[PDB]
Amino acid sequence: PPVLDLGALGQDFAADPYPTYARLRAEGPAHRVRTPEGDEVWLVVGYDRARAVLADPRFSKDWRNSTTPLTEAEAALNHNMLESDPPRHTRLRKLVAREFTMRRVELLRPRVQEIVDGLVDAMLAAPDGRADLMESLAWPLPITVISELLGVPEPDRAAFRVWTDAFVFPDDPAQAQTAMAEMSGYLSRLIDSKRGQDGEDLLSALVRTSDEDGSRLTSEELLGMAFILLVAGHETTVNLIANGMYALLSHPDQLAALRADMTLLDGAVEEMLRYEGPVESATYRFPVEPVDLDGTVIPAGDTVLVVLADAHRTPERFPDPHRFDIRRDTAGHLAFGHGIHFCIGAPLARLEARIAVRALLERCPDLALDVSPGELVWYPNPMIRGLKALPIRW
Ligand code: HEM
Ligand SMILES: CC[C@H]1OC(=O)[C@H](C)C(=O)[C@@H](C)[C@@H](O[C@H]2O[C@@H](C)C[C@@H](N(C)C)[C@H]2O)[C@@H](C)C[C@@H](C)C(=O)/C=C/[C@H]1C
């Protein structure tokens, strides 16, 4: 029953997966497919079923409920909140929930604004008048913010670029596994280096919590925490900033509307999340029992991917779904997930995106793409919507 090989779909599917998902949705909610790595997974498509499944407790995130074995490098890192169910998820999330409320994140606005102002200064100083938004803004800003929060020294941040690149588009399945092993070894060394140093960063606080009471946070969960907060704190926000400006720049009429009325900025970032959000499919879910989806039963322990990208093109929920419309009703989009695993970072992601978008539009007079929208290259990863590069001009 694998009705679709995702590996045999080419850059056409990478750049525009939506017709493929829409044809699946017309048949039903759940479809067995083959990942590019040859693994069999289920896709859940359509807004209503995707939203329901994201929050449905019958779909676990704990790999003890998955029949697909974890690799050695993955098993070193899986004791994290996103790959946990209650009660473990509940305890782990409580440890950092307070750090990421909208009120605490707003205390970061001065620093974020200062980072954005600096990065945009560097861009506008270009010897030509052109730049890659990927290298000039979308990559440096989130990695800088999350590194300062988790106390990652500046010389160490370069390796995160390489590791993330190996996670998104590895040369072979081994290079991603190798990147995970190096990242885990580094994080374990970083964790130990905070001991006794009285750091005020979030990682140092977590290390102390674990050292004080292994029943509140084990050493395995401490490494899982650092990992999850750094990876999820990074590559999704990079692509929100890139995908979001690609959306504005590829729709010059909406770029003009927003530039003419910055009070639309908040809705525009929400439509940015709706229209081309960085998460194409949610992270792995495993039914704890066979689950019947309108006649399609998924066996217990199979892998289930909720295709957020298709949910956001469901016309019943988002009329004229293929139109990027910054004044559209975006209520209930799933770009941050839904349920107990809803993104803990959403206020910080939104803060970074809003400041970055505003700064580009207020300070780059005639901002425009440097290539045509169809010339842009997208990474083939079915989990992520990401641009290889974003050439711009002003
Ligand atoms: C600003 C930096 C961010 C940090 C630190 C962060 C952190 C996290 C963490 C720790 C989780 C797991 C929560 C749990 O399991 O209870 C999570 C979930 C999630 N985040 Fe974020 N996040 C960030 C930004 C983003 C962005 C920009 C997006 C995409 C628009 C995003 C999308 C998601 C989604 C979809 C999930 C749920 C995955 C699923 O249910 O399988 N996050 N995030
Ligand atoms: C929260 C939405 C983003 O997901 C993540 O960043 C989470 C925290 C994450 O780090 C994992 C889900 C990674 O996914 C894969 O990592 C591979 C190296 C191993 C793989 N295996 C178990 C099948 C799986 O865990 C993440 C590094 C994946 C890449 C593509 C990514 O950046 C995804 C981001 C969002 C889905």
Numbering used by the authors: 12 to 405
Paper quotes:
Cytochrome P450 PikC (CYP107L1) from Streptomyces venezuelae ATCC 15439 is an intriguing P450 monooxygenase with unusual innate substrate flexibility. In the biosynthetic pathway of methymycin/neomethymycin (1/2) and pikromycin (3, the first discovered natural ketolide), the sole P450 enzyme recognizes both 12-membered ring macrolide YC-17 (4) and 14-membered ring macrolide narbomycin as substrates. To date, it has been well known that the presence of the positively charged dialkylamino group as a substrate anchor is a prerequisite for PikC’s substrate recognition and catalytic activities. Based on a semi-rationally designed substrate binding strategy, non-canonical amino acid mutagenesis at the His238 position enables the unnatural activities of several PikC mutants towards the macrolactone precursors without any sugar appendix.
PikCH238pAcF also exhibited higher hydroxylation activity towards the 14-membered ring macrolide 5 than PikCWT. The affinity of PikCH238pAcF to 5 also increased by 3.3-fold (KD = 87.1 µM). In the complex structure, clear electron density corresponding to the structure of 5 was unambiguously observed at the active site. The H238pAcF mutation pushes away the desosamine for about 60 degrees in the structure of 5-bound PikCH238pAcF. This substrate repositioning abolishes the salt bridge between desosamine and Glu94 as observed in the PikCWT/5 complex, and rebuilds a salt bridge between desosamine and Glu85. Due to the relative position change, 5 loses several hydrophobic contacts with Leu88 and Gln89. Nevertheless, there in PikCH238pAcF/5 exists an extra hydrophobic contact between the desosamine moiety and Tyr295. Importantly, in the PikCH238pAcF structure in complex with 5, pAcF238 introduces more hydrophobic interactions through the methyl group of this ncAA with the C5’ methyl group of the desosamine moiety and the C6 methyl group of the macrolactone ring. Moreover, three water molecules were found to mediate a hydrogen bond network between the pAcF carbonyl, Glu94 carboxyl and C3’ hydroxyl group of desosamine in the co-crystal structure. Therefore, the hydrophobic interactions mediated by pAcF238, Tyr295 and the water-mediated hydrogen bond network likely make the main contribution to the increased binding affinity of PikCH238pAcF towards 5.
